[PDB]
Amino acid sequence: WDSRMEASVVDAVVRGDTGPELLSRAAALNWDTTAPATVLVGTPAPGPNNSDGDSERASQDVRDTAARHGRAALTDVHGTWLVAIVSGQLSPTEKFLKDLLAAFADAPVVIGPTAPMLTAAHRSASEAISGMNAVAGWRGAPRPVLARELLPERALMGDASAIVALHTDVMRPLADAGPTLIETLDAYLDCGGAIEACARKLFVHPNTVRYRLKRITDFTGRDPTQPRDAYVLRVAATVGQLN
Ligand code: NA
């Protein structure tokens, strides 16, 4: 196992140095170069004492866990974080990922988008790293959390790609809803989710307001009645107006 070479492959994805030769470097480490690539970042699990080799233990676990599930992983460190690239399609509820999480501390883990192949994974890396930089700003984040689920936090920290993603992935689909839905959303967010009250203000049954929020969820995938969703819609609508 050549772990200088493993780190150089990870670091070349992190830096966006993704020429063809990256693939042979990876094949050489038993990466299937056709597979999807997902970057995640977290802290290594704290070991029984020893404590600089936490990172080396956690790397080994990660690679073992991958092998056991039929996948490959490459790792590198990013100061006190461990950066892992893992192969294959990746579901939130699936067992590979539950096991993988045991290699990390009981502290945030941020999962980047899945890329089609290793050489396409620079954005996955940049977003997972940006999310990890941003995750302190949502203390209640779930473990794990998607980079794309931290757009307010990344936006407030100055990550341009988060601002763009609020437009492209929240505002643009919102905008498909037309003025009756956006107006209802805006009112509901200002009443703080107080349905009876808002309904009176919008001259409609409570159940019409509820139905219209369920439509907001149809256009955008965010549920205005869930406090996280509602916060993301509200920040996204702001950013929408100021660009
Ligand atoms: Na993957």
Residue numbers in the entry: 165 to 213, 216 to 409
Kindly provide excerpts from the paper associated with this entry.
MabR (Rv2242), a PucR-type transcription factor, plays a crucial role in regulating mycolic acid biosynthesis in Mycobacterium tuberculosis. Regulation of the fas-II operon is mediated by Rv2242, the gene product located immediately upstream of the operon promoter. The MabR structure integrates three distinct structural modules: a non-heme globin, a GGDEF-like domain, and an HTH motif. In summary, only MabR-type proteins are characterized by the unique combination of a globin fold, GGDEF-like domain, and HTH motif, and this specific protein architecture is largely restricted to Actinomycetia bacteria, with few exceptions.
The structure was refined to a resolution of 2.03 Å, with final R-factor and R-free of 0.197 and 0.254, respectively. C-MabR consists of 11 α-helices and a β-sheet made up of 5 β-strands in a mixed arrangement of parallel and antiparallel stands, with the following topology: +2X, −1, -2X, -1X. Overall, C-MabR is composed of two structural domains: a presumed regulatory or sensor α/β domain, and an all-α effector domain containing the HTH DNA-binding motif. C-MabR displayed a clear binding profile, forming a 1:2 DNA-to-protein complex with an apparent Kd of 4.3 μM, consistent with the TSA findings.
